[PDB]
């Protein structure tokens, strides 16, 4: 996996190997974030494995990743969902297209990205890739939003920032 570097505008200028791109001085690159719900409306919350270089062992929204060069945002979502969760999903829907952020993890690892957010429904059972996901929980969106509002530090920075955006939160609720 590589990450796409972006300049002032979201114009791709080059690529870097994924692992090598995330350091204490991570440069701006493209990513995606996705919230998955099942047919019952429950939200899938996952805990990043201890082997993840950035934010290992952290509870976060369903799946996040980096689109590859030439790959559309939607297909990147499909690819990482199958890879980390072994699940098939409905067509990804945009919920927060202009989300951008920069955050530093406990180890000093930084994430600096233009990160559009999507939502989708799972159409198959989960088949966990323990190399990427160490735990997960199917919950009610309402309880997660309450958790995020009360103790945001207990979750990943991007999950918190995405869920606290008034418009994003409204669109997410439309999935329950
Ligand atoms: Mn990244």
Curated annotation (Swiss-Prot):
Active site location: 64, 113
Cofactor (UniProt): Mg(2+); Mn(2+)
GO CC annotations, alphabetized: cytoplasm
GO BP annotation list: dimethylallyl diphosphate biosynthetic process; DNA damage response; isoprenoid biosynthetic process
Chain segments annotated as coiled-coil in the UniProt record: none
Boundaries of every Nudix hydrolase domain copy: 27-161
Pathway(s) where this gene product acts: Isoprenoid biosynthesis; dimethylallyl diphosphate biosynthesis; dimethylallyl diphosphate from isopentenyl diphosphate: step 1/1
Principal EC category: isomerase
InterPro entries: Idi_bact, IsopentenylPP_isomerase_typ1, NUDIX_hydrolase-like_dom_sf, NUDIX_hydrolase_dom
Described function: Catalyzes the 1,3-allylic rearrangement of the homoallylic substrate isopentenyl (IPP) to its highly electrophilic allylic isomer, dimethylallyl diphosphate (DMAPP).
Protein name as catalogued: Isopentenyl-diphosphate Delta-isomerase
């Amino acid at each position: 996996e590589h990450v796409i570097l972006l300049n002032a505008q979201g114009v791709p200028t080059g690529t870097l190997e994924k692992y090598a791109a995330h350091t204490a001085d991570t440069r701006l690159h493209l990513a995606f974030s996705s919230w998955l719900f099942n047919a019952k409306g429950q939200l899938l919350v996952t805990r990043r494995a201890l082997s993840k270089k950035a934010w290992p062992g952290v509870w976060t929204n369903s799946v996040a990743g980096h689109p590859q060069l030439g790959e559309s945002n939607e297909d990147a979502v499909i690819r990482r969902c199958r890879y980390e969760l072994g699940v098939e999903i409905t067509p990804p829907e945009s919920i927060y297209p202009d989300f951008r952020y920069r955050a530093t993890d406990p180890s000093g690892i930084v994430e600096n990205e233009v990160c559009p957010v999507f939502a989708a429904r799972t159409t198959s059972a989960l088949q966990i890739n323990d190399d990427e996901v160490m735990d997960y929980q199917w919950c009610d969106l309402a309880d997660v939003l309450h958790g995020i509002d009360a103790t945001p530090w207990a979750f990943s920075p991007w999950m918190v920032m995405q869920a606290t955006n008034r418009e994003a939160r409204k669109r997410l609720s439309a999935f329950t």
